[PDB]
Motif scaffolding. Structure first.
Motif, PDB file in Angstrom:
ATOM      1  N   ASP A   1      18.067  17.904  -7.368  1.00 47.68           N
ATOM      2  CA  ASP A   1      18.241  17.771  -7.902  1.00 47.68           C
ATOM      3  C   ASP A   1      18.793  16.486  -8.372  1.00 47.68           C
ATOM      4  O   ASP A   1      17.863  15.386  -8.710  1.00 47.68           O
ATOM      5  N   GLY A   2      20.773  15.946  -8.103  1.00 47.25           N
ATOM      6  CA  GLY A   2      20.766  15.017  -8.628  1.00 47.25           C
ATOM      7  C   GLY A   2      20.539  13.932  -7.167  1.00 47.25           C
ATOM      8  O   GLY A   2      20.024  12.443  -7.635  1.00 47.25           O
TER       9      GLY A   2
ATOM     10  N   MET B   1      15.952  21.263  -4.658  1.00 47.41           N
ATOM     11  CA  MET B   1      16.695  22.076  -5.406  1.00 47.41           C
ATOM     12  C   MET B   1      17.217  21.957  -6.680  1.00 47.41           C
ATOM     13  O   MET B   1      18.275  21.048  -6.800  1.00 47.41           O
TER      14      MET B   1
ATOM     15  N   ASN C   1      18.783  22.923  -9.977  1.00 52.72           N
ATOM     16  CA  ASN C   1      19.551  23.190 -10.451  1.00 52.72           C
ATOM     17  C   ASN C   1      20.453  22.610 -11.940  1.00 52.72           C
ATOM     18  O   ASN C   1      21.131  23.538 -12.762  1.00 52.72           O
TER      19      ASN C   1
ATOM     20  N   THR D   1      22.323  20.022 -12.342  1.00 53.42           N
ATOM     21  CA  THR D   1      23.216  19.988 -12.416  1.00 53.42           C
ATOM     22  C   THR D   1      23.878  18.830 -11.551  1.00 53.42           C
ATOM     23  O   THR D   1      23.365  19.121 -10.467  1.00 53.42           O
TER      24      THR D   1
ATOM     25  N   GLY E   1      25.916  19.974  -9.119  1.00 52.81           N
ATOM     26  CA  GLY E   1      26.504  20.882  -8.819  1.00 52.81           C
ATOM     27  C   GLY E   1      28.343  20.732  -8.029  1.00 52.81           C
ATOM     28  O   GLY E   1      29.393  21.969  -8.142  1.00 52.81           O
TER      29      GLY E   1
HETATM   30 CA    CA Z   1      22.222  20.029  -8.997  1.00 53.56          CA
END
Ligand code: CA
Ligand code: TZD
Ligand code: TZD
Ligand code: TZD
Ligand code: CA
Ligand code: CA
Ligand code: MG
Ligand code: MG
Ligand code: MG
Ligand code: MG
Ligand code: MG
Ligand code: MG
Ligand code: MG
Lengths: 525, 525, 525
Positions: B427-428, B452, B454, B456, B458
């Motif tokens: 997502d980033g 994907m 989440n 953040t 990650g």
């Molecule tokens: Ca992420």
């Protein structure tokens, strides 16, 4: 103290309290233990980071601090740096480097030949030779960005430097004051003033460094004293004069022949805070017509050197404008007459003419609104139709690089929380830095984004027409739903397919508590 | 003939038939009368243009041609160029310059000191001294990009050059053939072969230039003959070996100590087509343990020079791999045993573990799928869980610059229309080059994008943990609706909040006639 | 008009009438039809060309024009450019390039990537994109070299450009006047003046930009008003103050600790026209001691940025020195007492102590002599022993690059025909630019060259001693006959093996009608 502690102390002592960034592993040792008195503004891509910081710096009239990830992050920001160079924006760009022990092997994330990467778009670019040098290098960066002519600078820092011991002698950096607030010596200033006083038909041309210096009011006084018409230099990145003042004559066409024709009959033309000149279109002819002499006041030696005509004085725009305004005689000539209001373009109940959009914005926006322009085919009409009484009321990408206005509008709004920012952005331009919308949503920065949707790269279609260029590919951008993009990034979205809807959407946007995007259906060229 | 006509003839005679671009005024005189046998692929921002072209070049194993707008356009692409440098991607980057008559005054859109702008990320950078030189300069660009070690090059062209008369002697450029398909001389090659034949416990390490050369099958033969385990060099931008072949041992950890430990007991380690080594994390120790000698075959003098250990041979990877595979003895040692299948991670009816996503992709994707990775915290699991039997099956940003995979996946899919491309993107990461989605929609390039989500960054949260770094700002990216972003750019959008929905969405995506984005709700770290 | 005609007209209209050069084929089309009102000064190697021009520019306080041959000629001059950068010397360096038609193939004598060659030692470096741009580019070069902070610039010109038609609009270049003669705004200047007036124990430190600005007399007035001791900033390239004035305290040691100790007890230290500071030796300690504040006036943003302590003002040194001298109060403190005369060193009838040489020069030279120093181990004694009452009386290689003084002394003597120039040059230093002697002979420029012959690189032997460095090679230079070298190049030669002979040789040299070289046998360290 650590290099980390010393560097943040230097930053705060030099007035920096905000970091615009997109983080990476080389920067984590800098960002850890982030000081509670600083704020971090995240953006999702580096062109957006730098654009936001740029708007903030330009509106605040102070340096902005940026933190990017190594080479890839720096590289993503280089289009934004091209605009910042042309606008003299004081930007301190820092980028994290690999740990010194892994630079030689060129580990992943090593920024190779780092200082060369952002050249030629920075005033100064550097990587320190040791950890203890970092605070001194940061001091150099701060002052290089801030001294006239202001501009972006670049500092690369190996991530292992931050935890090392600082040099105790770095404390001498903290309170350094560096001034470039200078003006022409008395003898030569008196000569200039006499030339202005003796002119029979003076004209004044103002550029963006006037607005950067907040010299606008002094230039109004100067124009009133000399009873002189005032033009804004071509390709204007800022607005340096109240656009309904009686002396105002608008934006100069960006052509050699057009400008010399405009200036014909003016015996002395005083240019302040502009390159001479930021021409654009091919328009060959005379630089000046016989009978016109030009005198330029610029903060930038590079501008003074490259002017093809005229005398030049390299000095601080604020100091020079103030001195001239207070020294010149009050001419007995009649004050110039204000330009007439623009015509109202016929508008049916369908798609919006850009002229209608600007008239409506002018009608509904507060008198202290700030506008950003990235609607490339409509600039001339925008300049004629918005009454901008105050300084800091207009921004346009100074190097012509699209992707500026959307993020810059967020930075400007952050800098000026009591002034409503309205960004007028073409459907083509909106995409370059679309992810910047997220920052407005996340930090609730209440910028209004007006998307002018005509489905095409209109300015390029127009230019293709003048070239008689047939079969040019890639000029149409159909199939973008800007309300969905706004939803994607958490920004309230409205549509305006006609004038009734435009007024309704603007009313809602102006009363909203957060950022709003309005997609406007505009006429196709 | 005009410079325009001659240059397009040169391009077609050298095998170029596609222009990846985002247009501007300095480029219109190049793009006018666009040849009917060429295709133009528009993208909405320059990082996307270059990413698409990069994927196309890497998958096609031939140069890709790019056309960008002056300094701002070039600058927007510089993060993409950082990846291209590290992947040895043969990219010909052209940018339009102002007309020669307006360069001196630095008119708007002048690319100042143009050749320095993309440095140090290009093999060659140039602006011709006259219009008639343009075809020759283009010839130089084509060959510089294409010769080993391949890489990006940059050519700046004043827009008035295109209409000028070409030099008739330029016809000698059209059919030039330039080869770097070379290998070690017989005497020294025999010495190398004997060292390999005599090794008691050889190991092989392969990097991305093996896949670029399509040397994969030769490396399989080499590994089978030597009965040697095969690792992929760290920070892998491509996959150079079938991942379920019995010799395969997976991706090497990107640490000095970790690699020397892995190689302990191997008397001869042959590295082919990789830097030695693209380490990443700080992991100090021995470069090699006593008893291990290393021999590197690389196409890049810069790689050979900087290796901290081992012998090196600078030569074409395709030619060397073929020669070695056909010259070495068949060892009587036992063939290595295949790695066991990865464990199935426990998965409830809620958010998806990344392991579940990769297992499901492996189950459902065609055997000739091509994967792109920009899901930074899940790379190790991806490498263990996808059976990639064929060459050209994996791409990951070679310089670690995010914004690669989304546009590159479109370029790869354009290059390989019969192989389903599946990009697995965090997502980033998805935001850096989000507008690339539009190109997939417009040209109906049927890439599947698996986001994907989440919430953040990650990988950065994980690294902050290992640093014990507290109070790091900017690590969370909540509030992005990827289905709305896909809608914004015209791409069919699906969601998967659990395994049942993931399977359903993948089934729909695999049968779709156009690009599809699936937003997957993944577990938070 | 041709580009040739227009360019020479521009040069003459901007005050240039001399070309310092070593010719080559790429420059012949520039040098043909050489204007009868210009003079050409030939030197036999390019370090000598630039050194002569540098001395001429520094002494004349105006730009000097240089013409060199392509890359090799430019390259031979780059050590000389390093000195010129540090001395802020306004040098316009032009170099001939291959004809545009042969640049692409990189014909012999092509200057590849020409503008990058002299970087980072020039303010501006450029090759024009067309012949008609050449006069404008030359205009830019003239103004860039001449604007504060002055420095060297570089322009590369394809040889075929000169015969092409010029743009008629180039006439606007001819009479451009560009000023950087600026000083601090009134409000802030008043604050500075009050700080100086209120200081209890001020000190003044002066650097080379004072002498360049001819601000010496104003600084004398300033020092007398403030009753302040005056030091010359370390590593001094020029002499900014009369060395027997009662306020004069000599050359500062080039060490951090040494300078803070010297300044201890001084509450306000005003530095004018110097970097803060050009330290040299490793001498760690405090930048300033508690109780001392520093204020720097500099013409160079790069100097202001890098100072590790103090406030700074970036402005013209001439304008600032004049303003301060005329604005400050007359302090009622006692005027500082003059430094005592130096001791007479014991001297037998053998080889000369350097102290004896300087005492004798001081005794015999005219009061308006000009000295150049390149006798590296004797600088401190030179500064103590020569009474230099007038501006422009001392030059020393500003970047520490040997090969400056011999050619610069010829340029200085050309600039100041009524002031006897005496260059005191070590036997080691004399060799770097030995061929410059020929220019003095050919043009009968009556410089006196005093060669201090001690057979060794004395300063390096001394430094090796302080490092306790044993077994350092290459420190001795035996076996050079300087009288024979002088004969080789047509310069009258004398020897001085003792004091009697030194006096005799100086008497002869001072009465000679041409240049003279005296080889002095000095004591070995
Ligand atoms: Ca992420
Ligand atoms: C980074 C970048 N890329 C390409 C261009 C060239 N560009 C094109 C792409 C612009 C057309 C913008 O389209 P728009 O929809 O935003 O506005 P108009 O339809 O009013 O022209 S104007 C023109 O300067 C640019 N200026 N900057
Ligand atoms: C252009 C750019 N900017 C910043 C980074 C630094 N970056 C950060 C931003 C990445 C986190 C990516 O988040 P993701 O959502 O895509 O994936 P994970 O959550 O699995 O880490 S990984 C890390 O390399 C980068 N690599 N490239
Ligand atoms: C171009 C160049 N090369 C080498 C040096 C290093 N160098 C050495 C070579 C100098 C010794 C000069 O010997 P000298 O005979 O001229 O004078 P002394 O014996 O008084 O030191 S001082 C020192 O700076 C230099 N400064 N410049
Ligand atoms: Ca549009
Ligand atoms: Ca010596
Ligand atoms: Mg660069
Ligand atoms: Mg004055
Ligand atoms: Mg504010
Ligand atoms: Mg052979
Ligand atoms: Mg194909
Ligand atoms: Mg003032
Ligand atoms: Mg003179």
């Amino acid at each position: 103290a650590s290099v980390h502690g010393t560097t943040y102390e230097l930053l705060r002592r030099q007035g920096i309290d905000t970091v615009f960034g997109n983080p990476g592993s080389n920067e984590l040792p800098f960002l850890k233990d982030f000081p509670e008195d600083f704020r971090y503004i995240l953006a999702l891509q580096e062109a957006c980071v730098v654009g936001i910081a740029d708007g903030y710096a330009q509106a605040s009239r102070k340096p902005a601090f940026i933190n990017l990830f190594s080479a890839a992050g720096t590289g993503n920001a280089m289009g934004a740096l091209s605009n910042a160079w042309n606008s003299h924006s004081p930007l301190i760009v820092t980028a994290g480097q690999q740990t010194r022990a892994m630079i030689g092997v060129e580990a992943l994330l090593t920024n190779v030949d780092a200082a060369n990467l952002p050249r030629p778009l920075v005033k100064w670019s550097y990587e320190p030779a040791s950890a203890a040098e970092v605070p001194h290098a940061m001091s150099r960066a701060i002052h290089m960005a801030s001294m006239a002519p202001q501009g972006p600078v670049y500092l690369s820092v190996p991530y292992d430097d931050w935890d090392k011991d600082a040099d105790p002698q770095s404390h001498h950096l903290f309170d350094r004051h560096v001034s470039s607030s200078v003006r022409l010596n008395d003898q030569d200033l008196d000569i200039l003033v006499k030339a202005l006083n003796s002119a029979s038909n003076p004209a004044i041309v103002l550029g963006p460094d006037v607005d950067a210096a907040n010299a606008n009011a002094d230039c109004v006084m100067l124009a009133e004293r000399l009873k002189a018409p005032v033009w804004v230099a071509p390709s204007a990145p800022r607005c340096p004069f109240p656009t309904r003042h009686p002396c105002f004559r608008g934006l100069m066409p960006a052509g050699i022949a057009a400008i010399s024709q405009l200036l014909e009959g003016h015996d002395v033309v005083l240019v302040i805070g502009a390159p001479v000149f930021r021409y654009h279109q091919y328009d060959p002819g005379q630089y000046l017509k016989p009978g016109t002499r030009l005198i330029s006041v610029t903060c930038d030696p590079l501008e003074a050197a490259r002017a093809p005509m005229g005398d030049a004085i390299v000095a601080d725009i604020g100091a020079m404008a103030s001195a001239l305004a207070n020294l010149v005689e009050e001419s007995s000539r009649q004050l110039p007459t204000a330009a007439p209001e623009p015509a109202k373009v016929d508008q049916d109940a369908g798609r919006l003419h850009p002229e209608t959009v600007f008239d409506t914005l002018n009608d509904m926006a507060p008198e202290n609104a700030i506008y950003l322009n990235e609607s490339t085919s409509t600039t001339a009409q925008m300049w004629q139709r918005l009454n901008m009484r105050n300084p800091g009321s207009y921004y346009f990408c100074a190097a012509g690089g699209l992707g500026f206005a959307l993020p810059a509008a967020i930075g400007v709004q952050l800098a000026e929380p009591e002034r409503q920012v309205i960004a007028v952005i073409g459907d083509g331009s909106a995409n370059y830095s679309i992810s910047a919308l997220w920052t407005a949503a996340q930090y609730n920065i209440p910028t209004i984004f007006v998307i002018m949707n005509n489905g095409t790269y209109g300015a390029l279609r127009w230019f293709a027409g003048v070239l008689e260029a047939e079969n040019v590919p890639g000029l149409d951008v159909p199939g973008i739903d800007f309300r969905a993009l706004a939803k994607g990034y958490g920004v309230q979205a409205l549509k305006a397919d006609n004038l009734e809807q435009l007024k309704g959407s603007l009313q809602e946007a102006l009363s909203a508590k957060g950022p709003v995007l309005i997609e406007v259906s505009t006429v196709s060229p």
